[PDB]
Amino acid sequence: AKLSAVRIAVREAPYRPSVVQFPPWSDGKSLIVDQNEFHFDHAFPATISQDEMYQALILPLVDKLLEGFQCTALAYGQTGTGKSYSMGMTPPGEILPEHLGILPRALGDIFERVTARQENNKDAIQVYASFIEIYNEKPFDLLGSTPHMPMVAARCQRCTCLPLHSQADLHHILELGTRNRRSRSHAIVTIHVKSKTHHSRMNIVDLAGSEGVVNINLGLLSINKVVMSMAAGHTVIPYRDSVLTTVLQASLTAQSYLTFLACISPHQCDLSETLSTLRFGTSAKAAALEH
Ligand SMILES: Nc1ncnc2c1ncn2[C@@H]1O[C@H](COP(=O)(O)OP(=O)(O)O)[C@@H](O)[C@H]1O
Ligand SMILES: [Mg+2]
């Protein structure tokens, strides 16, 4: 079948004249770059805080995750545009409160709802985290004993999930994974919600820089093909088109959720990279149709 929802958001990175224009009159989901008009589900200016961005874009997915639906939030775009910052890939301990990203905020709300529903509980719920890195189209388990050893025919499921009981634990897995981490390197930190009969995932994806100079991009790219193939029901999904779509195969299924976060530079010198990132958003936006 089709995914439950495919959403696309854009976040303007802080300015160091911005090429990004937010029209005086708009629905808050539009922007203009190099005279081109872009329309997505969310358009966040450089002034949007982490809290607001998380509340608008990710918080809604928390209930879905708890209900058993697979969820994926993926940041993409040029290096230095705030992808890691937005997703919260840096160990929480060494981060100021207002700067905390999506990962720590999501985990916080997950624990809260799990503790609030652990009495009108059917079964018990346990939370875990996995940290996978894709270096040159090769999956690596950053939480295992061989973080520098490629995976095959098992990166889809067989990969260490470490227990999560508090933010401190998240800090541990992020610190551990970061150390065991080694010309593109993508990161996929997944919050796993497991019960005796259910397993839902919240995949927080932080892709490597999309700038140029199979083709650097290709994942997400491959992601759009997957989204389309499912809609038109090609009765064969190109999951193996890339390591990204292979690792997230279990999450790229019917009544799963996919949310894109395009991070863009407001600098004129990055116009070309920004346009590339926004054009991809438009394409993923069209592929999200029929879903
Ligand atoms: N919205 C923001 N608010 C404050 N600082 C930011 C913001 N976005 C990016 N930064 C800072 O800019 C730098 C690069 O952010 P980063 O996420 O590492 O870019 P990327 O991961 O896309 O290559 C880091 O210092 C980050 O804290
Ligand atoms: Mg980064």
Give dist(CA 164, CA 281) in Å, integer. Answer: 33
Nearest CA to ligand 1 atom 3: 14
Nearest CA to ligand 1 atom 4: 14
Q: State which ligand 1 atom lies nearest to the alpha carbon of 263.
A: 22
Domain parsing of the chain, residue ranges: 1-291
SS (H, E, C) 165-199: CCHHHHHHHHHHHHHCCCCCEEEEEEEEEECCCCE
> 36-39 and 30-33 as β-strands: parallel, antiparallel, unpaired?
antiparallel
Reported resolution, Å: 1.9
**Is 11 near ligand 1, meaning CB less than 6 Å away?**
no
Q: From ligand 1's centre to the CA of 197, what distance in Å? A: 39
Give yes or no for a contact between 73 and 102, defined as CB atoms under 8 angstroms apart: yes
Residue with tokens 């509980």: 121
Classify domain 1-291 at the CATH topology level. Answer: Kinesin (3.40.850)
